Amino acid sequence: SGFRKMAFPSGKVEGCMVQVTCGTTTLNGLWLDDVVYCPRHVICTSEDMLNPNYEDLLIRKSNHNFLVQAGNVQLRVIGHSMQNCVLKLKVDTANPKTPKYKFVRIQPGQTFSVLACYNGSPSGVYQCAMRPNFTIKGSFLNGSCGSVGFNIDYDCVSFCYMHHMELPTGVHAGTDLEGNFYGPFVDRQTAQAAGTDTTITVNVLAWLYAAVINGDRWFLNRFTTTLNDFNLVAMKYNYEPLTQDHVDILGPLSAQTGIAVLDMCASLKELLQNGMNGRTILGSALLEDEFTPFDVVRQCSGVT
Amino acid sequence: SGFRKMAFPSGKVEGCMVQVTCGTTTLNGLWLDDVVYCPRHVICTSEDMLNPNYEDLLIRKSNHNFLVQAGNVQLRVIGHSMQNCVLKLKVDTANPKTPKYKFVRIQPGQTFSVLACYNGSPSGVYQCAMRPNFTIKGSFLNGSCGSVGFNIDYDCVSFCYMHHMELPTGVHAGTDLEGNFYGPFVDRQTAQAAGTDTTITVNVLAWLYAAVINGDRWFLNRFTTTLNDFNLVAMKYNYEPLTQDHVDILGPLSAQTGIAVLDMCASLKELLQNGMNGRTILGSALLEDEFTPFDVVRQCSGVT
Ligand SMILES: *CC(=O)N1CCN(S(=O)(=O)c2ccc(C)cc2)CC1
Ligand SMILES: *CC(=O)N1CCN(S(=O)(=O)c2ccc(C)cc2)CC1
Numbered sequence: 001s002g003f004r005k006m007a008f009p010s011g012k013v014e015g016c017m018v019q020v021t022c023g024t025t026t027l028n029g030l031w032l033d034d035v036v037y038c039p040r041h042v043i044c045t046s047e048d049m050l051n052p053n054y055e056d057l058l059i060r061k062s063n064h065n066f067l068v069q070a071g072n073v074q075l076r077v078i079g080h081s082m083q084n085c086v087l088k089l090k091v092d093t094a095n096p097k098t099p100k101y102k103f104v105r106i107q108p109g110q111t112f113s114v115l116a117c118y119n120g121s122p123s124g125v126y127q128c129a130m131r132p133n134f135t136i137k138g139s140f141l142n143g144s145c146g147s148v149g150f151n152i153d154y155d156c157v158s159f160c161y162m163h164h165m166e167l168p169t170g171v172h173a174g175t176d177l178e179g180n181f182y183g184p185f186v187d188r189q190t191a192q193a194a195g196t197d198t199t200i201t202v203n204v205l206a207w208l209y210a211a212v213i214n215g216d217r218w219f220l221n222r223f224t225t226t227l228n229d230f231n232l233v234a235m236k237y238n239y240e241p242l243t244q245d246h247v248d249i250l251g252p253l254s255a256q257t258g259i260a261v262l263d264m265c266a267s268l269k270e271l272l273q274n275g276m277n278g279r280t281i282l283g284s285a286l287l288e289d290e291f292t293p294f295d296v297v298r299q300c301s302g303v304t
Numbered sequence: 305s306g307f308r309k310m311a312f313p314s315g316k317v318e319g320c321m322v323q324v325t326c327g328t329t330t331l332n333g334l335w336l337d338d339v340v341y342c343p344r345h346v347i348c349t350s351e352d353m354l355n356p357n358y359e360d361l362l363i364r365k366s367n368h369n370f371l372v373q374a375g376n377v378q379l380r381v382i383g384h385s386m387q388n389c390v391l392k393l394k395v396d397t398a399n400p401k402t403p404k405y406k407f408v409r410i411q412p413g414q415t416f417s418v419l420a421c422y423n424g425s426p427s428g429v430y431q432c433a434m435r436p437n438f439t440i441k442g443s444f445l446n447g448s449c450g451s452v453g454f455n456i457d458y459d460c461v462s463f464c465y466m467h468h469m470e471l472p473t474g475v476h477a478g479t480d481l482e483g484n485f486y487g488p489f490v491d492r493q494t495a496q497a498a499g500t501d502t503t504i505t506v507n508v509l510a511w512l513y514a515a516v517i518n519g520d521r522w523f524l525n526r527f528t529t530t531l532n533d534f535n536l537v538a539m540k541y542n543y544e545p546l547t548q549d550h551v552d553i554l555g556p557l558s559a560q561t562g563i564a565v566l567d568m569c570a571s572l573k574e575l576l577q578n579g580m581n582g583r584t585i586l587g588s589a590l591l592e593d594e595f596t597p598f599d600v601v602r603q604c605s606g607v608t
Contacts, residue, residue, distance in 0.1 A: 304422050
């Protein structure tokens with residue numbers, strides 16, 4: 001029993017982190033096979049970041065300008081290419097610690113673990129969600145760029161995120177491992193404002209199921225609702241609309257608890273309308289939206 | 305910027321986790337050098353756990369009754385001894401992945417990372433605090449016993465916790481790596497009730513400093529207080545008394561923010577007296593007490 005915000009074990013990703021230095025910029029790279037992935041803005045001065053022309057900046061860089069250090073051993077760079085907003089540095093040595101991996105582009109609402117790194121060295125690991133406005137609420141200081149977000153399926157690491165920038169509002173923007181930003185963000189130091197940070201309704205319902213499963217039940221009520229009635233309330237509270245696809249995904253938690261999804265919706269509806277009245281659910285005074293239904297099933301069944 | 309509940313990277317500890325099976329009980333062990341550490345109740349039936357005589361139960365066990373599996377390779381057990389509530393299984397092979405390590409007994413209020421494991425396989429990692437009542441609020445299912453809590457100083461893993469039991473209230477009790485329980489708990493399935501779960505005042509103040517440092521400042525007020533005045537309010541709210549030692553420890557966060565510890569105490573005093581009024585601090589609707597002053601400095605400076 002007990003329910004915790006839980007990251008994947010980070011070992012498989014620790015073994016992939018390297019330091020990339022270009023000129024006087026140092027940040028993190030991801031070493032998989034004989035390729036090192038890193039944010040293209042490694043080639044920028046802070047001055048460049050105001051209005052960078054990356055193709056133009058890159059012309060002035062050779063393989064030997066990309067200094068790549070794994071532990072305290074330098075990797076030989078034998079090639080470099082730009083793909084979207086990442087550089088791929090071909091090194092002469094395959095990472096001997098390369099795990100089985102995929103690159104996946106996640107949807108908003110999906111959760112992942114971040115291994116915060118500085119100078120290619122892991123500092124800590126935390127669980128994130130891709131927000132519906134395509135930001136993440138991370139913990140990133142200067143030097144953390146190139147830190148990656150990932151899920152693990154048994155022995156396969158799916159890389160979904162690379163850290164690129166902080167918005168003036170202190171939220172975070174990055175790319176998948178093909179270098180395409182989540183949302184409309186650009187690797188340029190400009191006016192970039194996040195859209196509405198809506199609550200991931202399906203995740204709140206998963207976490208209410210996790211609560212019931214762990215003995216926190218005070219918020220179960222005598223009511224039910226409909227997807228349409230519920231969604232009117234969700235709209236009013238800047239909650240994402242709930243779809244039949246969401247209901248379907250909550251099916252197993254429904255089955256396990258014997259609480260119909262629409263009943264739990266009615267419970268969430270009253271919580272939105274009435275607030276928590278100073279009570280807590282799984283040690284939180286607000287409704288948690290960074291557990292997926294898949295995360296709840298995983299933690300409540302003890303998958304490895 | 306941004307502030308997250310952050311675990312240490314788990315890689316160094318992943319490489320230490322093994323499966324221990326005695327009869328029909330399977331749980332996790334910690335493999336350091338040529339010793340495997342595990343909860344002594346591995347030798348118990350569920351029947352035994354009602355009133356176990358561990359010295360008597362152990363007489364019936366030989367080295368070859370302790371089945372130890374690292375990945376899918378069996379370790380040869382050449383010795384076994386009971387120290388307090390852990391077994392030490394001497395194996396014929398030094399763990400080639402043994403990190404630099406210490407065993408430390410932490411104080412209540414101190415935080416650590418847990419690597420939740422099942423069948424010697426890591427499932428996830430989260431940050432805990434040792435509660436003032438010597439419980440932790442973990443996420444542990446059957447099979448998770450022998451999962452360990454740890455801090456890392458650069459390359460040295462300090463092991464502070466091994467998981468042993470869930471109380472009927474769904475909080476968790478365990479030992480240091482010398483097998484001595486935190487608090488009054490016994491590895492027996494009996495009436496064991498936790499004492500008062502008080503709030504770790506020094507940790508709440510550290511986290512209020514983390515908030516100010518990260519731009520959440522609405523709760524800064526025009527007031528100050530005294531240790532004595534503050535402590536009257538702390539008593540009333542089941543907060544731990546604040547000592548000069550606590551004030552001293554908050555000195556650097558004081559220095560960095562230019563907010564005197566006693567001023568921040570006055571801010572906390574008003575938050576206790578007035579509540580949050582539906583506002584949030586670092587995305588929480590209650591006062592977080594599972595960051596140490598050392599944790600705040602670490603995450604706010606980017607240590608590896
Ligand atoms: C986001 C990130 O890690 N990087 C790499 C470091 N650069 S920088 O331009 O070298 C820089 C370092 C430190 C400060 C305080 C500012 C800028 C930024 C991008
Ligand atoms: C806490 C823990 O992991 N252990 C090891 C497993 N035992 S047990 O007695 O084998 C057991 C397993 C599963 C259930 C549902 C009950 C008991 C408990 C202690």
